[PDB]
Paper text:
Here, we report a general and rapid method for discovering α-helically constrained (Helicon) polypeptides that cooperatively induce the interaction between two target proteins without relying on previously known binders or an intrinsic affinity between the proteins. We show that Helicons are capable of binding every major class of E3 ubiquitin ligases, which are of great biological and therapeutic interest but remain largely intractable to targeting by small molecules. In addition to possessing increased stability and membrane permeability, Helicons are capable of binding large, flat protein surfaces that are inaccessible to targeting by small molecules, and Helicons have been developed to target a range of PPI targets in cells and in vivo.
We further characterized by x-ray crystallography Helicons derived from these screens. This result highlights the importance of biochemical and structural characterization of screening hits to ensure they will be of functional relevance in cells.
Author numbering:
A (entry chain F), C (entry chain E): 1 to 17
B (entry chain H): 4 to 16
D (entry chain G): 2 to 16
E (entry chain D): 195 to 532
F (entry chain B), H (entry chain A): 196 to 539
G (entry chain C): 196 to 532
The structure:
Amino acid sequence: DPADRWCELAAWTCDTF
Amino acid sequence: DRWCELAAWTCDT
Amino acid sequence: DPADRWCELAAWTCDTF
Amino acid sequence: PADRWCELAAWTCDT
Amino acid sequence: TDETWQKLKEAVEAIQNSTSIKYNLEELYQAVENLCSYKISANLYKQLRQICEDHIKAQIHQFREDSLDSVLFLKKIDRCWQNHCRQMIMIRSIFLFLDRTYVLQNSMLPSIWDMGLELFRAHIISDQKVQNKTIDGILLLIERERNGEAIDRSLLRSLLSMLSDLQIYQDSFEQRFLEETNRLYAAEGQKLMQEREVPEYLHHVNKRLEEEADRLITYLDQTTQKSLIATVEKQLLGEHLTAILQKGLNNLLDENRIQDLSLLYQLFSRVRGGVQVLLQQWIEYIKAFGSTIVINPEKDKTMRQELDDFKDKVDHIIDICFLKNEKFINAMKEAFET
Amino acid sequence: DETWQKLKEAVEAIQNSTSIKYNLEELYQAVENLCSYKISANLYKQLRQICEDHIKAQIHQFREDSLDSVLFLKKIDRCWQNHCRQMIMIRSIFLFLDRTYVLQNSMLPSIWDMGLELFRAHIISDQKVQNKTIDGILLLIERERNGEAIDRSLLRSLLSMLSDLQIYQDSFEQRFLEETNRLYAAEGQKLMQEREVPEYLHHVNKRLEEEADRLITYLDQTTQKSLIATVEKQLLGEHLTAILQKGLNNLLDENRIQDLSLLYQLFSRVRGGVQVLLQQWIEYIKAFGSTIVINPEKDKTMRQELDDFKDKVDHIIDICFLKNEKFINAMKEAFETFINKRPN
Amino acid sequence: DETWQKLKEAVEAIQNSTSIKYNLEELYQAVENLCSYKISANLYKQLRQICEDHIKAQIHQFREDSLDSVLFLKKIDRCWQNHCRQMIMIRSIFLFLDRTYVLQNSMLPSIWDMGLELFRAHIISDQKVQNKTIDGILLLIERERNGEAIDRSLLRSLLSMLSDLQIYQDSFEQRFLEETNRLYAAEGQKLMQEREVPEYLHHVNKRLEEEADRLITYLDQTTQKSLIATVEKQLLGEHLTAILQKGLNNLLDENRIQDLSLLYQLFSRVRGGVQVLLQQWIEYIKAFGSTIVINPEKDKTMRQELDDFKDKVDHIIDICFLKNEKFINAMKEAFET
Amino acid sequence: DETWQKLKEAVEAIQNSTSIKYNLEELYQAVENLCSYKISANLYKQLRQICEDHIKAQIHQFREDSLDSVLFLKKIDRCWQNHCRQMIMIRSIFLFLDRTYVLQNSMLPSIWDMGLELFRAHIISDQKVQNKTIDGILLLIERERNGEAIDRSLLRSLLSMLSDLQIYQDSFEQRFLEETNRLYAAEGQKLMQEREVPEYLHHVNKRLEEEADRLITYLDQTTQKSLIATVEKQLLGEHLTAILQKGLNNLLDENRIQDLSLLYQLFSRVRGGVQVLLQQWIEYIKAFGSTIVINPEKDKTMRQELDDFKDKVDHIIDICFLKNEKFINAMKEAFETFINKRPN
Ligand SMILES: *CC(=O)Nc1ccc(NC(=O)C*)cc1
Ligand SMILES: *CC(=O)Nc1ccc(NC(=O)C*)cc1
Ligand SMILES: *CC(=O)Nc1ccc(NC(=O)C*)cc1
Ligand SMILES: *CC(=O)Nc1ccc(NC(=O)C*)cc1
């Protein structure tokens, strides 16, 4: 479960910034 | 009849 | 002589002033 | 007269 | 010639473009001293003026971008100004021998700093379209702030300070600012004088006078103090003195509203004809209230005390609200002997 | 000698508020000759003497060492209002004198300044008189800050006097700044305990506006910098960390735009203020990241929660913080370094 | 209204320089009462009126036609001194009014400024009066520059008046600088022909000191830079090269230290002055040296003659040119060619 | 801290007159960031110290105060021009710092003023340095008054510095007026014996013009009143009667209009000058009356001689005394009083 959140975060951080 | 007490107070005051 | 000069001075002083 | 152009250049080096 | 000047000309251009000065400073200072002590064609001042004029004339184009946000435009004016000052200060450091000599030689030419101010005024702010969009934005922020919106006060202070250093604060801004302040508080006076009772109105007037005092402290120039406060005092108080008493003084005295009465005296103290116009209505109130209590008694107590209750009530008001003011005591005695 | 006695009586009439028993052309002529057949030093010192005598006599009235402070201040004011009025008229009669000394390049002060020195020395310089004046002036200001109504016109007249006498700084300004510092230090500390950050910010803004009003109305402008800095220090500077750690989280989590705008406006006034807010702005985002890797609010699909947060924060930067780029870059750098300290 | 009538006579007595037939406290009462039982903006307007009435009556004296300029200026000065004295006393009685408007922030001028406006409006604003005033003031300055004695106190008072009325720059300063320019421009060219360089330099120094005296005495301080610059330009700047080409050789060939020191002092005041002098210094040394190696003297050895010149020349740098390095370096570089 | 190291090297480059090994835009960022993240205080205190270090290192060159005075003064001047040149540039790089502290109501001095305090504290305040500086400045002024040529540009730059450092009045001005007083007091006494009244008046006017020139050129304008008052006093005020009884009669008997016009101009500058002259003008006319009734004078008739005197004297009043009424009345009163002394 947490491994998925880190991947979703890395995507959002690149998409957003 | 009150024009009497007023002038009394005005002199006293 | 000096009495005459005093007289002339009085005249000149009146004529001038 | 040419003994003075030489004396000037010496004075100019010295000064 | 030439050679040496190219050193300074490249140093100046590096300063203008924010790049690198490719010499040790002693070499540049020496260059200035040489061109001033062996005049050839010379006049290094006129050449320095020229490369400053060229660079500054190139700065006009950024302020012509169509349909650009006002705040963004103001920020470009400020950035342009902060760059100009910083560059000119450094040029002045390199050329210190030049303008200290021209002062020592008692020159009529402006200092290098003033020469920069003249050029900046001439080619940037003098432009009618540039100045107009500059002043419009400055006034618009003040209007937004008076309407409750948050603005950059530091930005306002920097721009208005610029207008002062350029010696156009009075011509360009202060005139229009007072005119817009005059129209705004004139309207606000008429509007809130109908919508709110005198207690809520007086609190609001005091709130604005402090706000306008705050804008003076924060970003306006100190010479605006006299005209601004007088304008607000006129449009919120002077134009309504008589209307405020006929609307609220009777209710304030009858229900003994000490705090609102104290404030009424403080605000009326600010305006010529104010304490006096209040004193007139203070007399009318005593004659009315007194001459109707000898006609209609509030048949609760006898007449001597109800009259003694009244003088106690009024004396407390003179003592605290009107600050022991003799003229209000004398006016009360005169009224009682009517 | 008959000429000087004319002027001596004219001055005495001005000082005693009586009648000038001569037509002025006679008096103006008197001044010109005393400068035109004798030495003028003579006449300046003679007028200095008759002014000094009268003013030395005005000190006795202030010796009732028990009487209301406001009445004492009103008495100083009228004595001052009379001194100016007397000296101005005396200056009018002796005008040929006062401009001649400019022509003769004398170092002796003007008639107006000469009166000011005498008034300073024999009245206001008096330790008891000056102490009771300043005490009352300060006590008047102390009352206004506590909510009481006072005569601002009186305060302006006395302080303007102290400025004209060039003793405003030594006598009043420093002690005034000392009392303002001591007062708002306590007020800052107490309301920092007694009220929440939103009402505390509103109060600080009201005091800063009040002090600006007092500055415009009756204080001298040369006090502007020191006074405003003092209030800014004691109500904001000494509490920056305390204000943020007490209310900022509550302000950002509840999306209270207006209080955040005022928080930004007030912090802009103080050295280090926007920076201290900026650091805690960063810590708030790092905190947000560290609870979304542990606790997703299982209502939305995580991408929406990260997008709901970003808009909320984008809006706060846009309106409360005035589009400040430094807050946008700091948010980017915060997210882009938080992801790097991710487990391998 | 019986109260106001008291002051009308008090003001008129001050204006006619007669007697104030009331005790001063009685008048202090009149002003204090009329401001507190009506609006004060009603007592100020009346005082302006009677001040306007009186001052409008003073214009007729300046119409006399064919009147001597100095007498005209003295009539202006008296009118001004009377106005100030009257207004200063009027201000004393009406002090409560003057400060009431100051206490509340009124836009109405102080009584003193109100009087200044009336004096400007009804006396000086009249062009014919102002033009005859400025012509006379400039004519006195011109008379003084030509050596005649004038009343500087009159000059100082009138210019101070123009400053108090804030027309010093518009009406006087510009015309003054223009007349200073033309006068010294002509004087520069004229004495540059009529007098030798030593006498010309002495005269230029005398003028610079005189103009410094006129500046301290009766001109305004803001005229300082432009005035000194104008005199420096027309007596030195326009003649720098011409002075040297006429006199520098004679100054050096006679070793005239005192006149040479003055030359350095005066040329230091002007842009390029030391530079043009330094240039001709090089030309003089190159010339002198090349005329002794081409045509030598006959006393002792020539290398020694090449040393007396060095003694003579080093001395001039030491005293006349104040140890100025640029003159030492230029002397060497001249000799090396 | 790596960011600050760039600016520290740039400042050191400015101080040592070497090369700035960075592009300027890079340096402006360093200033702007350090004011926006590390609080501006810290950056001000760090800049102050490296400025103090460099300037405190400049005192050692002044440690040999046996050196030639002008060379010492020129060494002070170069040290000052270098300090100004450097501080102006440091001000340019740190302009964002200087404008932040002004925007924020700071009590901290500007970067320029901070440089001034440090320069005064470590350089000019040094008693040995200040004493050798002030001595030489006065010594150049003394040399110029004695006729020697000096560097006025050096003198102006040194005095301007003392004003910029706000120590012109205490350290220089009082001693300057005291030396001006002593010099012209003696010069008055000495030249009053060595030169006749015509040559002395020309000289007094020559000094007043010279001293007016020294004010324009290198002294500060606040020295104007006291300086001229000193020269007027020591060359005229202390000698008024002595000038008149030594030269006035001869000037009038010889109709020396130019010297008479100048006498009136110079006496107009001094308190009692026109006065003492007017009194001796009376004595001269009373003298004239007393010798024309004693002498039978056979050249012209007495009315002729009395009419030439009136023309001559009217002319002197007209041009030398500027139509001064007080002098016409004094002549009328003199002749009318003299004729009443006539014997009975
Ligand atoms: C599992 C994982 O590491 N995913 C992931 C998604 C997106 C990105 N995007 C960028 O790096 C720009 C990295 C990693
Ligand atoms: C009926 C009446 O009013 N009588 C009367 C009133 C007042 C006074 N007051 C004084 O004498 C001071 C007298 C009589
Ligand atoms: C001898 C003598 O005293 N003569 C004399 C002549 C003329 C005047 N004139 C006036 O007094 C006006 C007086 C005396
Ligand atoms: C005639 C000739 O060659 N003279 C001469 C003069 C000088 C020098 N050298 C220096 O002056 C240093 C060489 C030759």
